């Protein structure tokens, strides 16, 4: 689970405590770590193991199954045709990356930026961002026209970070959108961008 | 490539270990591997065929996975699984066949088909697993540039060759001296004949020799060597060297004298056997040299004396011979042998689908032609093609 | 010894199931076994070679374990592993070879080399595992003193023997009666000849018989029996029994009459077949007895009558024969056959390293000599040596 | 263009300095340069090929930069890198080849291909670095206008020329006087013959001279000059100047008298050597003039006197000669020589892809034709094309 | 192995970039690499030598690091460094030499010596760096199984062969027709002779042909082709084919007619040149075929007519010839050539230390014998051994 962080002490501490017998603390450091060194080389009670194998197989499915948060977004600076799906109505979703580089946000954020992204964005090039992310729904037909989705991005640059990267979706249903002076005029949705949250 | 392999051992160890009843904890380690696959696949499109009489079937992926619960397996579990396997089987078959016909002068050792080229892709490597099938085993060890090796019962190292050489002849062909032989597969039979029964020969002995150069080195060969060449022990009417007439061969057989077999490697004698008939070992050689003599019998009963006069006509032709058979051996290069179906599988798939002759292999995958001019390109293509045939035979026979 | 075995299946199932990709879970059970080894080894020191042209090599151990951490396997993981395997491979090779040369009369069964003697030690037994390799399988069952058994294609049970026996002869060798044969490997060809065509024989029938005593019992043998001995169907000039002269054999072949094959065990008939040609089963025997007759044709066309006069000279020699081939069989003792490379491996390693002739095996591991005097010591040494060759072939071919 | 260069030294110094085990800091300065590239590239798309048999492949860029895992690289690091390099290699190859076939009379010194024309663009200049490869080194120095210069072993300056000039002849060709020669590559052999052995010549001496005009000046030439022309020291039957008949040359060799070699530059003697055989230096010249004489021997033993009568027939033809070889030299213009593969690379790529004859180069890049009419356009195109071949050979041989 | 490489470039780039003066900053990146080494080594122990007349030497490590402090370099700094380098130099020398002598059939590619086998160990891999040395460059690319390639001046592809073939001969050897040649190194000279000057030949033309099969393919070859074979243009007394007598060859040379050179690859014509003398390119071939004719001159001056009578004795023997020299070429396999010292280095070290003949290389590393039977084992051993020689020459010449 690539949790390249706690692993050392963290688990060990709780472990010993539950054993009662001894009061950690006074456990020389070569001891606690060495204790892991030995632990990491054993099987796993079928029970225990058997379950993790299960969680991992469905892991993916859960993550995209949620209501808040989708995996990454795409920028193409190419007027694009908004798609339509029975559930969200008229929205800009993409069920598949393929045709645009992938940039592990996790990788970037954790390791600082070299602006590779900064250059691609600047000379305005097709690019994708992957991982879990914030989220924003909007009903402002107008919005789309204002090309809001191509905004949010500039941000990042400033200082590293990338937490403040709420992207945008346009839940434009033929209803709850006071903004409907749309289907009254011959026309088609020009979204400059869309997102990965696969359909429930 | 290696990718491909897995796909099968996956299915085999699958269509095998997944039966109504078995306990789950026997497949826990397996089940996993399986699913892992489906995932990597789903979302991919393929295409096979397009050549000769080979259909162009298209494939897509979109499958659910498998429960993990259940102490034991219920019939229902299987059937919902078998249904998914059958699509992969019918798939691989088409995948194998599609890459089992194309040949490339250049990189006849690399993937060809649009189907496979896509597999060597990195995103698919997450599927490799259990490479113990003798062929793949050797495919790897080679890709890493190391010492390969295979096993063959009655290997097929000798291109068919049946001929003779007249060392002494004349128009009437009534007093010939020479040798005739048959080299084919793993066997050699050679006879030395002297119509005069060495009557005017020094020490009344006529020397013979037969040399056979293998196109590939054979190591650890178990060989049967026997005196006499039964194939050349009967009366024959043969065409003359120039094809203009026919001569008569009327053999009478004597024991080969001073038999010496040498198994040489790059001109060096590695093994030598003097008059030893039965089972002998030749551990590493690229050439076999058989030397033997016809010695006129110094003492003859009347019946024998009558066959060998001091003057022509010579009506009974003194003949000595040898028979050598390579029962088993190891070769660093793939070869056809008497047990493996690889050559037959490749040849059969190409014939069934009317695959056009290509730039590498001889028409009909003819073995004699192939082994006679066993170029590096033919060997690399043959190995690729044999390895695929072996992957296919794990599921489809 | 069994120890040794593991070392390999460890490496094979290793160099096989460990590759750029696959899931940990498929090797979890494996990885462990592996490490377990490294441990037991590290600290210990070895020595191989020292005999004949065999190099002396020392080996030490001090290696890191394996990341039981990761989920999948990344290329880097492999390479850091393969580097460790290659030292063990190059090791075992040297270990096998070193114990594949030494022989011993007293205890020719147990280990010899300083390398292996150290392995049978108790502290290493912590490594045995998966003994499904046919040979080791039988090595164990023999320790526990139980019913063993191997499988062979065209076994090599008959020491080479090519000779004749004249039951009626005279100086001129113009009216002989007797048999000639070739016993070699898994085949027997025998011909009975009567120059007089049973002209003065009771019922005009001459009886023949050929008995072959196996050095080991063969069970579950599939055998091809055919009439005629092609090898003895052609004209020959042969040396007399005393070597003083040569006789003439000019055969004409007739069908063998009243053919009876008996497969006996300790003098008892286990299987008997009367004139049955084709495929027959001999389930347990240590002796084969072939009885057949030459019956003078009671009715002859002129051309036939002309070959068989009432008085000498007898110029066409009536001959009847049989051919018997053991295609497959099971033997409780190791033997050479037409498919296994064991004999060739042992013989080859000894030849390559110029290993001196020892006290047990005949010079050159000569098969005929070995099977002719197949003593208990030769068999125990042969089995030890064949089992090691089979362990070696799992990794090095 | 220079751009191009970098692309390679980048990859070389890459596929070289980037290996499993080197400390990061040994590539810190390098890594950077690399990334810098990827950036500038990604986004822009290219077209190569589109001529003769050359394939039109489309390249597109989409790559992630390079990590920096500290303290010597882990295998995994490499493989993820090598995968990216291989796309650039297979790229450049196609880039080189595409610009290595196009020629242009007007401006055949600049980029032709759609691929390269795009590189000279400014937005790419950001890559250029380490211009130490002898060829690029000189490519620059020429763009600024300065003293260029290359190094060659056995330079190929002389277009093939093998002929003769009869200064005195008659229909029967029985009393000729003249010279015959072979100018080819870096060598000149010339013989002067006088059938009359200067019998009626002033001072009994016949003067000879051979002048060779180089198409380009050679400087710093190390030259071997030897007396005698072995090539013209044997009997020959030659075609007459008009091709109507054949004459007989039956040489007998005498030492060349008053040998004088002049290396001239624009008509001026730069170096002159009088009868100096062995190694001589010619520091700057565009012309070589060899003058030598045949002097009738004033004193002759009978055997010699017999060869040279006072009256015809003249049966032994007095011949004197010289051999001159340019071992090494420097030229301001690119040339083929005996060590560099440039000409062969360019010629080979064009031949392999069936590139049609263009407007600049002679059919087949024929060297003799090229050097015979070495126009400015051919030289500019040759230099461009040779420089590209040298860039390519840094990665692909 | 690659390990080894570094060790040197380390020292070279060391004994080179480290001197009384320069700024730290120019070596900062270097210094590091260095130290890194010392560390990995220290503690370890080695052993070299032991074979033939080669001394056995043991080495230990326990050295101080380097002052990464100073700004500039003071004399004292160097001397304390040079003292440490000299121990490594004298070391490597002994390491190279020790592995430059051992050969091996099975695995003639991998390391042999106790010294190197220990280096391939993983714990040392922490030293690789800057692999721009042409040889190592290709050593790697071959491990990854990719397209290699080297550069050669006057390559040594032709095993020495000097012989003749008489197509028409008779006991007196007074009217012969055939060819004689010399194939050696990178050169071929062949002459076709017809004592009768095609007097009775169809169209008064005698056809000749000379075929030479290379043991390895040469690519990108720059070749000089010239008419005439000077080597066979003079009078000779030669031994007859059977060695029983001697014949007289008295040549008179005519221009070769209808010259056609074909460079074939696997039987296919890759390059063909018709009567083109001078410099030609052969881009990929494993065979050279030279065809040329002797055409009786249709018009002859008296002197010429006199050489060619209508009836014997034929005293002047019409001869036509060709000379072909491969100036440079690329080969995927290592070869000896006229510039590289590899073969000489390997041969010299073996000779100096009285290294016994081994199982792979011919006695004395004889080039002709080696290239004549250039087996895969000899090539792998040769490449290993040549690569080591090249590593050694970076420090010791
Ligand atoms: Zn068989
Ligand atoms: Zn040269």
Residue D181 alpha carbon to ligand 2 centre in Å? 21
Residue E168 shares a structural domain with residue E281: yes
Annotated binding site of C for Ca(2+): 266, 286
Other C-beta atoms lying within 10 Å of the C-beta of residue E250: 16
CA atoms within 13 A on the CB side of B280: 21
- What are the strands, taking DSSP E only, across C275-316? 278-295
CA–CA gap between residue D48 and residue B73 (Å, rounded): 58
Q: Which of D328, D349, D375 is the last residue of a domain?
A: D328
Note whether A touches E: 3 CB pairs or more under 8 A: no
Residue of D nearest to A107 (CA): D67
DSSP letter for each residue of B287-347: EEEEEEEEE--SS--HHHHTTS-SSS---SEEEEEEEEEEEEEEESS---BSS--HHHHHH
Q: Can you tell me which residue has the tokens 């269509």?
A: B15
Which chains, if any, share at least 3 CB pairs under 8 A with chain B? A, C, E
Helix (H, G, I), strand (E, B) or coil at D239: strand
CA atoms within 13 A on the CB side of E13: 21
Q: C205-227 and C278-295: which strand pairing?
A: antiparallel
The DSSP bridge partners found for residue E260 are E274, E291
How far does A184 lie from chain D, in Å, by closest CA?
Answer: 39
Whether D254 and D297 have beta carbons less than 8 Å apart is answered as yes
Question: Cα-atom radius of gyration of chain A, to the nearest Å?
Answer: 23
Structure tokens at B136: 């793949």
Residue E154 alpha carbon to ligand 2 centre in Å? 6
CA–CA gap between residue C22 and residue B130 (Å, rounded): 9
CA–CA gap between residue C242 and residue D172 (Å, rounded): 87
Closest by CA position to B128, among listed C23, C12, C79 = C23
Residue C129 shares a structural domain with residue C144: yes
Interface of A with D (CB under 8 A): 100-103, 114, 116, 119-120, 123, 125-126
DSSP label at D255?
A: P
Q: Which of C16, C230, C343 sits opposite B130 (nearest CB)?
A: C16
Other C-beta atoms lying within 10 Å of the C-beta of residue E26: 11
Helix (H, G, I), strand (E, B) or coil at C159: strand
Helix (H, G, I), strand (E, B) or coil at D97: helix
DSSP letter for each residue of E305-345: HTTS-SSS---SEEEEEEEEEEEEEEESS---BSS--HHHH
Other C-beta atoms lying within 10 Å of the C-beta of residue E198: 20
Helix (H, G, I), strand (E, B) or coil at E155: strand
Q: Give the torsion sign (CA, B265, B270, B274, B279).
A: negative
Q: Which residues of D touch E233 (CB under 8 A)?
A: 234-235
Residue B367 alpha carbon to ligand 1 centre in Å? 18
- E145 and B143 within 8 Å at the Cβ level: the answer is yes
Residue C169 shares a structural domain with residue C244: yes
How far does A20 lie from chain D, in Å, by closest CA?
Answer: 40
How far does D39 lie from chain A, in Å, by closest CA?
Answer: 7
Give E202's contacts (C-beta < 8 A, 6+ positions apart).
Answer: none
Which chains, if any, share at least 3 CB pairs under 8 A with chain C? A, B, D, E
Helix (H) and strand (E) counts for chain E? Answer: 9, 16
DSSP label at B155?
A: B
DSSP label at A30?
A: H
Interface of D with A (CB under 8 A): 35, 38-39, 42-43, 62-65
- What are the strands, taking DSSP E only, across chain D? 45-47, 58-60, 150-153, 158-168, 177-185, 187-194, 205-227, 236-239, 246-249, 251-253, 257-265, 268-274, 278-295, 317-331
Q: How many domains does chain E have?
A: 2
Whether residue B380 is annotated as binding a ligand: the answer is no
DSSP label at A93?
A: B
Q: b/e for D243-260, b at 16 or more Cβ within 10 A?
A: eebbbbbbbebbebbebb
How far does D211 lie from chain E, in Å, by closest CA?
Answer: 19
Whether B282 and B257 have beta carbons less than 8 Å apart is answered as no
Q: Any idea what the CATH number is for the domain that residue B276 is in?
A: 2.60.120.170
Q: Any idea what the CATH number is for the domain that residue D20 is in?
A: 1.10.1350.10
| Burial class of residue E58 (count of CB atoms within 10 Å of its CB; 0-12, 13-18, 19+) | exposed
Q: D317-331 and D251-253: which strand pairing?
A: parallel
Summarize chain B as % helix, strand, coil (round to 5). Answer: 30, 30, 40
Closest by CA position to B363, among listed E293, B354, A128 = B354
Closest by CA position to E322, among listed E213, E210, E237 = E210
Summarize chain E as % helix, strand, coil (round to 5). Answer: 30, 35, 35
Q: Pick the ligand that lies closest to the CA of residue B325.
A: 1
What Å distances lie between residue E98 and E109, E336, E392, CA to CA? Answer: 15, 22, 12
Residue E279 shares a structural domain with residue E295: yes
Q: Can you tell me which residue has the tokens 């101080």?
A: E64
Other C-beta atoms lying within 10 Å of the C-beta of residue D310: 7
How far does D97 lie from chain E, in Å, by closest CA?
Answer: 15
Note whether D touches C: 3 CB pairs or more under 8 A: yes
Whether E366 and E351 have beta carbons less than 8 Å apart is answered as no
DSSP letter for each residue of E92-130: HHHHHHHHTT---STT-SS--SHHHHTTTSGGG-TT---
Q: How far apart are the first and last CA of chain E?
A: 20
Residue D171 shares a structural domain with residue D297: yes
Residue of B nearest to E360 (CA): B266
Residue C337 shares a structural domain with residue C320: no
CA–CA gap between residue D298 and residue D257 (Å, rounded): 13
What Å distances lie between residue C255 and B234, C165, C299, CA to CA? Answer: 19, 21, 14
Structure tokens at D140: 């620059």
- E114 and C57 within 8 Å at the Cβ level: the answer is yes
Residue E272 shares a structural domain with residue E378: no
E373: left (phi over 0), alpha (psi -120 to 50) or beta: beta
Helix (H, G, I), strand (E, B) or coil at B63: coil
Closest by CA position to B337, among listed B182, B158, B215 = B158
Q: Which of B269, B295, B328 is the last residue of a domain?
A: B328
Q: Pick the ligand that lies closest to the CA of residue D155.
A: 2
Closest by CA position to B294, among listed B323, B272, B322 = B322
Closest by CA position to E200, among listed E280, E313, E351, E309 = E309
CA–CA gap between residue D79 and residue C76 (Å, rounded): 8
Whether residue E153 is annotated as binding a ligand: the answer is yes
Residue B202 shares a structural domain with residue B309: yes
Q: Which residues of D touch E277 (CB under 8 A)?
A: 160, 162, 184
Whether D284 and D264 have beta carbons less than 8 Å apart is answered as no
Q: Which residues of A touch D63 (CB under 8 A)?
A: 101
Q: b/e for D88-109, b at 16 or more Cβ within 10 A?
A: bbebbebbbbbbbbbbbeeebe
Closest by CA position to D330, among listed D82, D171, D151, D137 = D151
| Burial class of residue D135 (count of CB atoms within 10 Å of its CB; 0-12, 13-18, 19+) | buried
| Burial class of residue B48 (count of CB atoms within 10 Å of its CB; 0-12, 13-18, 19+) | buried
Q: Which of C278, C310, C328 is the last residue of a domain?
A: C328
DSSP letter for each residue of C64-79: -------SEE-HHHHH
Interface of B with E (CB under 8 A): 143-147, 266-267, 284, 375, 377
Angle between helices E342-352 and E376-392 (to 10 degrees): 90
Residue D139 shares a structural domain with residue D199: no
- D79 and C80 within 8 Å at the Cβ level: the answer is no
Closest by CA position to B324, among listed B230, B249, B253 = B230
Whether residue E250 is annotated as binding a ligand: the answer is no
Q: Can you tell me which residue has the tokens 């009369």?
A: C105
Number of B–C residue contacts, CB under 8 Å: 175
- B222 and C338 within 8 Å at the Cβ level: the answer is yes
Closest by CA position to D263, among listed D271, D274, D254 = D271
Q: Which residues of A touch C32 (CB under 8 A)?
A: 43
Give D26's contacts (C-beta < 8 A, 6+ positions apart).
Answer: D17, E29, E32, E33, E129, E130
DSSP label at C229?
A: -
Q: How was this structure determined?
A: cryo-EM
Interface of E with C (CB under 8 A): 114, 117, 120-122, 125
How far does B131 lie from chain C, in Å, by closest CA?
Answer: 5
Residue D188: domain span = 159-328
Whether E169 and E292 have beta carbons less than 8 Å apart is answered as no
Closest by CA position to C201, among listed C295, C298, C65 = C295
How far does E266 lie from chain B, in Å, by closest CA?
Answer: 8
Residue of C nearest to E105 (CA): C352
Closest by CA position to E106, among listed C46, B281, B288, C348 = C348
Q: Can you tell me which residue has the tokens 């199984």?
A: E145
Residue B199 shares a structural domain with residue B342: no
Residue E153 shares a structural domain with residue E192: no
Closest by CA position to E157, among listed E341, E348, E288, E289 = E288
Give D262's contacts (C-beta < 8 A, 6+ positions apart).
Answer: D269, D271, D272, D288, D289, D291
Residue E135 shares a structural domain with residue E145: yes
D40, D41, D62, D70: best mutation site toward chain A, by most A Cβ within 10 Å?
D62
Q: How far apart are the first and last CA of chain C?
A: 20
């Amino acid at each position: 689970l690539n949790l390249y962080q706690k692993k050392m002490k963290a688990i060990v501490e709780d472990f010993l405590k539950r054993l009662h017998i001894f009061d950690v603390a006074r456990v020389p450091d070569d001891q606690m770590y060495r204790l892991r060194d030995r632990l990491r080389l054993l099987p796993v009670e079928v029970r225990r193991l058997d379950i993790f194998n299960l969680i991992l197989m469905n892991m993916d499915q859960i993550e995209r199954a949620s209501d808040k948060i989708a995996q990454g977004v795409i920028i193409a600076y190419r007027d694009m045709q908004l798609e339509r799906d029975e559930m969200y109505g008229y929205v800009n979703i993409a069920r598949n990356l393929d045709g645009f580089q992938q940039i592990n946000l996790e990788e970037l954020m954790r390791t600082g930026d070299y602006a590779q992204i900064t250059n691609m964005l600047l000379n305005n090039q097709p690019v994708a961002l992957v991982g879990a992310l914030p989220f924003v729904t909007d009903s402002s037909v107008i919005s789309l026209i204002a090309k809001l989705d191509a905004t949010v991005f500039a941000q990042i640059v400033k200082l590293r970070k990338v937490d403040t990267l709420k992207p945008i979706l346009y839940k434009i249903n033929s209803d709850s959108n006071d903004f409907y002076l749309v289907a009254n005029y011959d026309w088609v949705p020009t979204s400059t961008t869309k997102v990965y949250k696969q359909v429930p | 490539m290696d990718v491909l392999y897995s796909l099968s051992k996956t299915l085999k160890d699958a269509r095998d270990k997944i039966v109504e009843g078995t306990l789950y904890s026997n497949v826990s380690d397996l089940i996993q591997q399986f699913n892992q696959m489906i995932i990597t696949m789903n979302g991919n499109e393929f295409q096979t065929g397009g050549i000769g009489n080979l259909p162009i079937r298209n494939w897509n992926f979109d499958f659910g996975l498998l429960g993990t619960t259940l102490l034991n397996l219920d019939a229902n579990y299987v059937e919902t699984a078998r249904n998914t396997i059958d699509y992969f089987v019918d798939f691989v078959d088409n995948v194998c066949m599609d890459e089992m016909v194309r040949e490339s002068q250049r990189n006849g050792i690399a993937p060809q088909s649009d189907s496979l080229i896509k597999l060597s892709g990195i995103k698919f490597k997450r599927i490799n697993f259990d490479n113990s099938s003798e062929y793949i085993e050797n495919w790897n060890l080679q890709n890493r540039r190391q010492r390969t090796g295979f096993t063959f019962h009655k290997p097929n190292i000798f291109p068919y060759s049946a001929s003779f050489t007249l060392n002494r002849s004349q128009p009437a062909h009534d007093n010939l001296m020479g040798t005739m032989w048959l080299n084919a597969g793993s066997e050699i039979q050679v006879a030395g004949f002297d119509y005069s029964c060495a009557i005017n020969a020094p020490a009344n002995t006529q020397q013979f020799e037969h040399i056979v150069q293998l196109r590939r080195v054979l190591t650890t060969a178990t060989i049967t060597l026997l005196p006499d060449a039964e194939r050349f022990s009967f009366p024959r009417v043969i065409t003359s060297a120039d094809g203009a007439t026919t001569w008569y061969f009327n053999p009478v057989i004597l024991r080969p004298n001073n038999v010496e077999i040498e198994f040489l490697l790059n001109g060096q004698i590695i093994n030598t056997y003097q008059a030893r008939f039965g089972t002998i070992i030749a551990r590493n050689f690229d050439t076999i040299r058989l030397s033997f003599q016809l010695m006129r019998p110094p003492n003859m009963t009347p019946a024998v004396a009558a066959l060998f006069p001091n003057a022509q006509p010579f009506e009974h032709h003194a003949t000595v011979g040898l028979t050598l058979r390579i029962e088993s051996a190891v070769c660093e290069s793939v070869l056809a042998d008497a047990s493996e179906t690889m050559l037959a599988n490749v040849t059969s798939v190409r014939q069934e689908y009317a695959i056009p002759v290509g730039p590498v292999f001889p028409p009909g995958m003819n073995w004699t032609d192939l082994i006679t001019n066993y170029s590096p390109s033919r060997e690399d293509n043959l190995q690729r093609v044999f390895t695929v045939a072996s992957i296919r035979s794990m599921l489809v026979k």
